[PDB]
Amino acid sequence: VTTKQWMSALPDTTNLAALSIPGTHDTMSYNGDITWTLTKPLAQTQTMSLYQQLEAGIRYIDIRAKDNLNIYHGPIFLNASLSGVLETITQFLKKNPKETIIMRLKDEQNSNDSFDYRIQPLINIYKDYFYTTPRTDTSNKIPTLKDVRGKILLLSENHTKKPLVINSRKFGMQFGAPNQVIQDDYNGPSVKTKFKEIVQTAYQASKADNKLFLNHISATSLTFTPRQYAAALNNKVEQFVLNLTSEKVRGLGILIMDFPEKQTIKNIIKNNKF
């Protein structure tokens, strides 16, 4: 099947936690302002544009923004706006209505509750593309593909530390909620150690089916750039996934990468049973 519509070929009854999903770390860092070009080797995490990543099979995106509604990487403007991102995601879901996108939306300047209010008018404009549940519901249960067809599963991360609530609807869930298991050891780990943590988290994900596993392949170091880590790790992780597929082991969770290759993305998708 085509990477452009791989999820459409899956059963409506399949739970989101029972899948192996390819994702990108700092999705929008493939372009930026003059500061981005000057610090490029340290700041860059992708080569494909948002739209190219979606067509390549990426179903998990990591979007960082500030209350001015622009996309950032710390003090670095990424030449993109949240409205631009939402229109792109929405156009993709309109063209391929059976796919679902998991989106981490982070407040790049955690210190205010103004971000929460600012993004509301924008999200509300595209509410028909967001998986939503009643405000009076704390079940935080992971949905099946039936409930998220052609929709965005939002994972909010901000100062409030609570899910985005607009009116009487709760848009998605909170990033870091009890139903999620996160491996994000980015602070200069050795390749050997980082690989162990990736493998261990993938192993645990395969055994669980009621939790979302966000497994970060990405990392940074003063002496090692995101590009260098990815060149060492993506292939190792790709071979590991290929082996587990032979062993009939599925549902490895969300594998979040920097500079993923078309090949690697396809092999992670192939881990799911069609």
From Swiss-Prot:
Name of this chain's protein: 1-phosphatidylinositol phosphodiesterase
Keyword Phosphoprotein on entry: no
Q: Which InterPro entries match?
A: PI-PLC_domain (IPR051057), PLC-like_Pdiesterase_TIM-brl (IPR017946), PLipase_C_PInositol-sp_X_dom (IPR000909)
Superkingdom, taxonomy of origin: Bacteria
Q: Which molecular-function annotations from GO does this UniProt entry contain?
A: phosphatidylinositol diacylglycerol-lyase activity; phosphoric diester hydrolase activity
What's in the keyword line of the UniProt record?
Cytoplasm, Lipid degradation, Lipid metabolism, Lyase, Secreted, Signal, Virulence
Q: What does this protein do?
A: Cleaves glycosylphosphatidylinositol (GPI) and phosphatidylinositol (PI) anchors but not PI phosphates. Important factor in pathogenesis, PI-PLC activity is present only in virulent listeria species. It may participate in the lysis of the phagolysosomal membrane.
Q: State where the protein is found.
A: Secreted; Cytoplasm
The UniProt record lists the EC number as 4.6.1.13
Under Pfam families, the record lists: PI-PLC-X
Q: Where do the PI-PLC X-box domain residues begin and end? A: 16-154
Subunit description? Monomer.
In terms of one coarse class, where is the protein primarily found?
Answer: secreted
Biological process GO terms, please? lipid catabolic process
Q: Which residues form the active site?
A: 25, 73
One Gene Ontology term, aspect cellular component: extracellular region
Gene3D superfamilies in the cross-refs:
Phosphatidylinositol (PI) phosphodiesterase
SMART domains, sorted: PLCXc
Query: Catalytic activity, per the record?
Result: a 1,2-diacyl-sn-glycero-3-phospho-(1D-myo-inositol) = 1D-myo-inositol 1,2-cyclic phosphate + a 1,2-diacyl-sn-glycerol
Stored PANTHER family:
PTHR13593, SI:DKEY-266F7.9 (PTHR13593:SF113)
The gene for this chain is: plcA
